C-alpha cells in the first residue's frame, strides 16, 4: 500500500505552501478577491480545472483567470478542502456548496454534500430540496425527495415553494402512486390552488394536470371554478374539457389503504436463525402481515406512533461480536411504504426498553436503564423532529425501573409501581400526582381521551386502576373476566375510538389463546369485540410490545406460516 | 487536521496519474541527456535542496531547462518516484549511489531510510567499505556502527582489499581505539606494516604517525629493521623522530587480550521476584559469576549456539501474551562489548527451544516445534551468516522431540532417543548412522574432538560415539550421590573434555561441581567444586555453552554468599 | 481399471490395479504444510482428478481442483475454485459425480 506517513507529510507541506504562498503561479480572480493557488491541487480535486489548464486554450499560459458565476466563501472552502481534506459543512451553505461543486464537477465534495442532504431531508425543506434536485441532476436526491415530499406534502400540502415548481415535476408528483392521502379530494384542491397561482401561465398545463387525476373529480365541482378563472372568450378550453374526460378510468390510489392495525415487535421468530421478529395483526382483515426485522435485530427497544402516524425506534441492544449483548443508542425510523428502517440521528446515552412518547412533535424517551447511573440516573431527553437533534429535559425527580409513560393534555405522564409525576413541557418541571393504592409493575397504559388506564401489573393480573386528569384521582372500575388458573398477558391500546385490550391467556398444559375485548367506558365492562382464531396468529412470546398505528396492506406481504 | 482517508488517498492517486501523463509540469531535470519532467511542489516538499533551488531568487528558480549534473539517472528517477508515491523499494546494490544522491539533494526521509538499511546490513565484508563511505559523507550512526563492526571483525581478518585505501584520520581512529578484538599485539603491528608497505614514500609522515600509534610493545620487535630495509635514501631526521618513540606515550594493556574462556548460562533463578529467568556466566579460571542482559527481557525458552569465531546467537522462544505464552520466531545476537542484543533477520517458523548448530559458517536450526502440527513435521531450516537469509534444506528423516544436535568434522549430527542421522552439507541429504542400544531422552550431547559424548537421559548414561569408527560404547558411570537426580552438562573446556553436574536430594541443597574426565581412564577426576558463596541456584531448564567474553564490558552478579 | 485410495490418517496415494493385483505409490499431492487436506477423488470427464481443501491456523479454507496424469504422477493445476462463488463446505461433506439440469435446479445465493 501507499505509505500514509509520506502522504500526510506531503499534504501538510502543500498546505503550508498554500498558506505561505511560495509556489503559487495561478490566481483565481472572483469578484475582486485574490485566490493564489496551484494547478496540481486544482487538477487533482476538480475535474473542471484539469480541463481549464491542460486544454491548450488561452488560459493555459495566462496566469490570471476571472472565474465568474461563483461565490467567494464557497470557492475558499473548496480550495481549503482540496488542500487539507477538511470539509466543514453547516446547515445553510450546503446549497451554494452543491452549486459550486456542480460548477467544478468536484465529485469528492459532490458526494459529501449529497450525503449531507440525504441526511438533512425533512418536512420544511422537502419541496425546496426536490426543486434543487430537479435543477441539478441527482437521481439519489431526486428519489429520496420524491418519497419524502410525497408523504409529508400529501400530509401537509401548504408549503410556499410548492407554487414555484416546474410542470414536469408536478406531473411526476401528482401522477405517482406513492401519495399518502386519506382522500382523493385534497390532491384535487392542491392542484386547483397550484393552477390558480397564475391564469395564463397555467392554461397550457391545465390540460395535462387533469390528465393525471382520476375522473371521479373531473366531472364534479371544481370545473365551473376553472371556467370562472378562464381567460375571456377562450373557446379552446371549455369545450375541450367538456368532451375530454372519456379516458383515465377511475383507479383508487394507495394512500386510501391505511387501516388501524396493531403493530407487534420482538415476536417469536418462526425461523430459529433470528432470535426475535416483528409481526402485525389486522383487526379488519383478520390476518397477520409480516413486518421487517428490527435494524440489526435490535432487541429491548421502544415504539411510538406520532399523531402524524409515524413509527420510531430508540435504544435497544445488539449481540456483541452463551450470553453476549451490548447496548447501543442508535435511532431508526420506519418507512411505511418501502418496508425498511431508515437510520436517524442516534441518541446521547444507550437505553434498554425505553418509553417513547410523542408530544408537541417531540419524541420523549423516559428512562430505560441508562449506562451512566450517576445521581441523575433518571435523566430523560427529547428529540427534535424539525432540526433532527436531541435535547435534554428536566430530570425525573425519582429513579424508577420498569415504568410506562403516556401523553395526555399536552403533558407527559410517566407511571411507576405506585408513584406518578406529570411533566410540563411549557415550564420544564415535574409536579406530584395522585398515589396508587396497589403496588403493581410490568404493565402498560393506554391514553384514551383525557383519562389514563393502567391495565394489569405485578405474571400480570386483571386489576384496572383508572386515573382522571381533570379529577386527579385513581379509582377502580372492574376486573377483566378471564379463565382461572391462567396467566393472561394484558396489552392496553386505543382503537376505533374505544379502549380495547389485547390479552393473551395460557391455561395449564394448554397453548396460548389470543382474544381481544372491548371495555365499555360508561358500563365499566369488557365486552367481547372479536376472538382471534389461532389458524392465523401463532405464539408471539412474552417480551413483545403492541402499539396503535396505520399500515398499508399492499406494500406489506402476508407471512407464510402454518396455523 | 490531516484527514488520511478518502481525500488523501484520491489526491495522491491523481498526483501519481499526473506524474505519469506529464500534466501540469513546469520544471524538467536534465541528467546527462535524460529528461525528467516533474513538478516544483513535490521537489520542494521532499528535497531540502530543490526548495532553495526554486525559491531562492537566482537563475535556476525560473529556469525551466535545468541541467543538474553529478547525479545518476536511475537514482534521481527512484527518488522522484518515491516522492510521488512514498515507496522506496531499495535494492542491496545501488544503496551507495542512492545515499550519495540523497545527501547531495538533502532529502531527509530517504536519507534516514538508507541510513537504517546500511546500518542493518554491516554483515561481514562491506564493513570497511561502508565505514569509508560514512567517513566521506558524515553519518554519526553509520560511523559508530561501522567502527564497532570493524573493531570486531577486521581484528580477525586484517587483510581486506578495501581496508588498504583509507584516510589517515579514520585509520588513526581505528588503531588508537581500545576496542581491538585481538588476542595478540603483533597482528595489529603487521596489519599496520602491510598498510604501510603497499604505499611507501607517499605516506611517510603518516607512516611515522601510525608507528607511534601502534606504540612500543609492537614498535620494539621488527619495525626498525623493516623500515631500514624500506627507508628512502638520504633520510636522517626520520631516524631521529623514529628513535624517539621508545620511552613515552603511555604503554598500556589492550582490551582484546581479555578473551577468557567462560560459560554462558540462560534461564537462571532470578533474584528479584518480579523477574522470572536471567542469563548469567561463570568463570572457570577467575572463579567468578558474571551476569548478562536478557535479549528480549520478557521472552524465554531460547536456544544457544557458539560459532568458531566466538559469537552468541539466540533464536526462537516463547513470550507471555500479557493479555490485560505466545511463540515468536525472532532472532538476536549478543554484543561482546556493548552488553546488548542487536536483532537480526527473523525466522520463518515460530519454534520452541530450537537447536542451532554452526557448520561451514552457516547456522543450522534443527527441530524445535517448528510451529506445531505440520504435514511433514520432520523439517529443518538453516541460516546464512553472510547473506543474512534463511534457506530451506532437506528435511529430517524422522520426527523427534527433546533431541540434541552437534557438529563434528564439518558434518551435522543430530541425536535423538535411539537414532542418529548425519546431514551432508555438500549434498544436502541425510545418511543413516548407528543406533544406540539405550532409549534415553531429555539429554544433550557435546562435540569434543572427533567423539560425541551423549551424557544423561531418562541419568548417568555415558555413551561415546566415534565418527571414524561408527560405534556406540560405554565408558563408566559418573560418581554421584544416591537418591538424587543429577543434571548433566557436557561441554569442551580448554581443549579438555569436562562436565558440569548438579545433584539434588530430599530436604537438601543443590551443589555445583565440575569434574575433569580422561579419555583412557574413564573416570571423572575432581577438577573444581563450585562454591555456593559465589554461585547460587540455577534451576532445571538452564542451558550451558562455551564462549569467550569480556569481563570489563560485563558486570558481576551481586548475591549474598 | 484402477482404484485410487487417497488420504487417510493424509496425502497417501496408493494405486491398485485389478489385472496387476498390486498396491503402489505414485507421488504426494502438492499441499501446503500445517494443513489438513480433505481429499476427494472422483472421475471428471473421463479424466482422473481430485477436489481438496486446505485449512491452516488463523487462515481461511481454499477450494481448488487439480488434474492428475497417470504416467506423470503429478497433479497439474486444472482450476482453482474462487471463494466469490463457493463458500465453506465443512468436514463431513461428501462428493459424487452426476449429471443434472440447470433450469430445474436453482442457483445458491451467497455474497462473494
UniProtKB/Swiss-Prot annotation, chain B:
Keyword tRNA-binding: no
SUPFAM superfamilies linked: Kelch motif, POZ domain
Keyword Repeat part of the UniProt annotation: yes
Residue numbers bearing the Phosphoserine modification: 294
GO biological process terms, semicolon-separated: gene expression; glucose metabolic process; lipid metabolic process; phosphatidylinositol 3-kinase/protein kinase B signal transduction; proteasome-mediated ubiquitin-dependent protein catabolic process; protein K48-linked ubiquitination; regulation of cellular response to insulin stimulus; response to insulin
InterPro entries with a match to the protein in the record: BACK (IPR011705), BTB-kelch_protein (IPR017096), BTB/POZ_dom (IPR000210), BTB_POZ_KBTBD2 (IPR030586), KBTBD2_BACK (IPR047074), Kelch-typ_b-propeller (IPR015915), Kelch_1 (IPR006652), SKP1/BTB/POZ_sf (IPR011333)
PROSITE patterns per record: BTB
Domain BTB: from-to ranges: 25-92
Pathway: Protein modification; protein ubiquitination
Renumbered ranges of Kelch repeats: 311-361, 362-410, 412-450, 451-492, 498-544
Function as written in the Swiss-Prot or TrEMBL entry: Substrate-specific adapter of a BCR (BTB-CUL3-RBX1) E3 ubiquitin ligase complex that acts as a regulator of the insulin signaling pathway, modulating insulin sensitivity by limiting PIK3R1/p85alpha abundance in adipocytes. Targets PIK3R1, the regulatory subunit of phosphatidylinositol 3-kinase (PI3K), for 'Lys-48'-linked polyubiquitination and proteasome-mediated degradation.
Domain notes for this protein: Recognizes the BCR (BTB-CUL3-RBX1) E3 ubiquitin ligase complex substrate, PIK3R1, through the 4 tandem C-terminal Kelch domains.
PANTHER family associated with the record: KELCH-LIKE PROTEIN 22, LD33804P
Quaternary structure and interacting proteins, as annotated: Component of the BCR(KBTBD2) E3 ubiquitin ligase complex, at least composed of CUL3, KBTBD2 and RBX1. Interacts (via the BTB domain) with CUL3.
Name recorded for this polypeptide: Kelch repeat and BTB domain-containing protein 2
Organism: Homo sapiens (Human)
Curated annotation (Swiss-Prot), chain C:
Kelch repeat intervals: 2-43, 49-95
Coiled-coil intervals, chain numbering: none
Domain of life: Eukaryota
Domain notes: Recognizes the BCR (BTB-CUL3-RBX1) E3 ubiquitin ligase complex substrate, PIK3R1, through the 4 tandem C-terminal Kelch domains.
Function per UniProt: Substrate-specific adapter of a BCR (BTB-CUL3-RBX1) E3 ubiquitin ligase complex that acts as a regulator of the insulin signaling pathway, modulating insulin sensitivity by limiting PIK3R1/p85alpha abundance in adipocytes. Targets PIK3R1, the regulatory subunit of phosphatidylinositol 3-kinase (PI3K), for 'Lys-48'-linked polyubiquitination and proteasome-mediated degradation.
Assembly description: Component of the BCR(KBTBD2) E3 ubiquitin ligase complex, at least composed of CUL3, KBTBD2 and RBX1. Interacts (via the BTB domain) with CUL3.
UniProt name for this protein: Kelch repeat and BTB domain-containing protein 2
Source organism (scientific name): Homo sapiens (Human)
Gene name as annotated: KBTBD2
Amino acid at each position: 500500500q501507499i505509505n500514509t506517513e509520506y502522504a500526510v507529510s506531503l499534504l501538510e507541506q502543500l498546505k503550508l505552501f498554500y498558506e505561505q504562498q511560495l509556489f503559487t503561479d495561478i490566481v483565481l480572480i472572483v469578484e475582486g478577491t485574490e485566490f493564489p493557488c496551484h494547478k496540481m491541487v486544482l487538477a487533482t480535486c476538480s475535474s473542471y480545472f484539469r480541463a481549464m489548464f491542460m486544454s491548450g486554450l488561452s488560459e493555459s499560459k495566462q496566469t490570471h483567470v476571472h472565474l465568474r458565476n461563483v461565490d467567494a466563501a464557497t470557492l475558499q472552502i473548496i480550495i481549503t478542502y482540496a488542500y487539507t481534506g477538511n470539509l466543514a459543512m453547516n446547515d445553510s451553505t450546503v446549497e451554494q456548496l452543491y452549486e459550486t461543486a456542480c460548477f467544478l464537477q468536484v465529485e469528492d465534495v459532490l458526494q459529501r454534500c449529497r450525503e449531507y442532504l440525504i441526511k438533512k431531508i425533512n418536512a420544511e425543506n422537502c419541496v425546496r430540496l426536490l426543486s434543487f434536485a430537479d435543477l441539478f441532476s441527482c437521481e439519489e436526491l431526486k428519489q429520496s425527495a420524491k418519497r419524502m415530499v410525497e408523504h409529508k406534502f400529501t400530509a401537509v400540502y401548504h408549503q410556499d415553494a410548492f407554487m414555484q415548481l416546474s410542470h414536469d415535476l408536478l406531473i411526476d408528483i401528482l401522477s405517482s402512486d406513492n401519495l399518502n392521502v386519506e382522500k382523493e379530494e385534497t390532491v384535487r384542491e392542491a392542484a386547483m390552488l397550484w393552477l390558480e397561482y397564475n391564469t395564463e401561465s397555467r392554461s397550457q398545463y391545465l390540460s395535462s394536470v387533469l390528465s393525471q387525476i382520476r375522473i371521479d373529480a373531473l366531472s364534479e365541482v371544481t370545473q365551473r371554478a376553472w371556467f370562472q378563472g378562464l381567460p375571456p372568450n377562450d373557446k379552446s378550453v371549455v369545450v375541450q374539457g367538456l368532451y375530454k374526460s372519456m379516458p383515465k378510468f377511475f383507479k383508487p390510489r394507495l394512500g386510501m389503504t391505511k387501516e388501524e392495525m396493531m403493530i407487534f415487535i420482538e415476536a417469536s421468530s418462526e425461523n430459529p436463525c433470528s432470535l426475535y421478529s416483528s409481526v402485525c395483526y389486522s383487526p379488519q382483515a383478520e390476518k397477520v402481515y409480516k413486518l421487517c426485522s428490527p435494524p440489526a435485530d435490535l432487541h429491548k427497544v421502544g415504539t411510538v406512533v406520532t399523531p402524524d402516524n409515524d413509527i420510531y425506534i430508540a435504544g435497544g441492544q445488539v449481540p456483541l461480536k452463551q450470553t453476549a449483548f451490548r447496548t447501543v443508542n442508535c435511532f431508526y425510523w420506519f418507512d411505511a411504504q418501502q418496508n425498511t428502517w431508515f437510520p436517524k440521528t442516534p441518541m446521547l446515552f444507550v437505553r434498554i426498553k425505553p418509553s417513547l412518547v410523542c408530544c408537541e412533535g417531540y419524541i420523549y424517551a423516559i428512562g430505560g436503564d441508562s449506562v451512566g447511573g450517576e445521581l441523575n440516573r433518571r435523566t430523560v431527553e427529547r428529540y427534535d423532529t424539525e432540526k433532527d437533534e436531541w435535547t435534554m429535559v428536566s430530570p425525573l425527580p425519582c429513579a424508577w425501573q420498569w415504568s410506562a409513560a403516556v401523553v395526555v393534555h399536552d403533558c407527559i405522564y410517566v407511571m411507576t409501581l405506585n408513584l406518578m409525576y406529570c411533566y410540563f413541557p411549557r415550564s420544564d418541571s415535574w409536579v406530584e400526582m395522585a398515589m396508587r393504592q396497589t403496588s403493581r409493575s410490568f404493565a402498560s397504559a393506554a391514553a384514551f381521551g383525557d383519562k389514563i388506564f393502567y391495565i394489569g401489573g405485578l405474571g400480570s393480573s386483571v386489576t384496572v386502576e383508572i386515573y382522571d386528569v381533570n379529577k386527579n384521582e385513581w379509582k377502580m372500575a372492574a376486573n377483566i373476566p378471564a379463565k382461572r388458573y391462567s396467566d393472561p398477558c394484558v396489552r392496553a391500546v386505543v382503537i376505533s375510538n374505544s379502549l380495547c385490550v389485547f390479552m393473551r391467556e395460557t391455561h395449564l398444559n394448554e397453548r396460548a389463546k389470543y382474544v381481544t375485548y372491548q371495555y365499555d367506558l360508561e358500563l365499566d365492562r369488557w365486552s367481547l369485540r372479536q376472538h382471534i382464531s389461532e389458524r392465523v396468529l401463532w405464539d408471539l412470546g412474552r417480551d413483545f410490545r403492541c402499539t396503535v398505528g396505520k399500515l398499508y396492506p399492499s406494500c406489506l406481504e402476508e407471512s407464510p406460516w402454518k396455523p
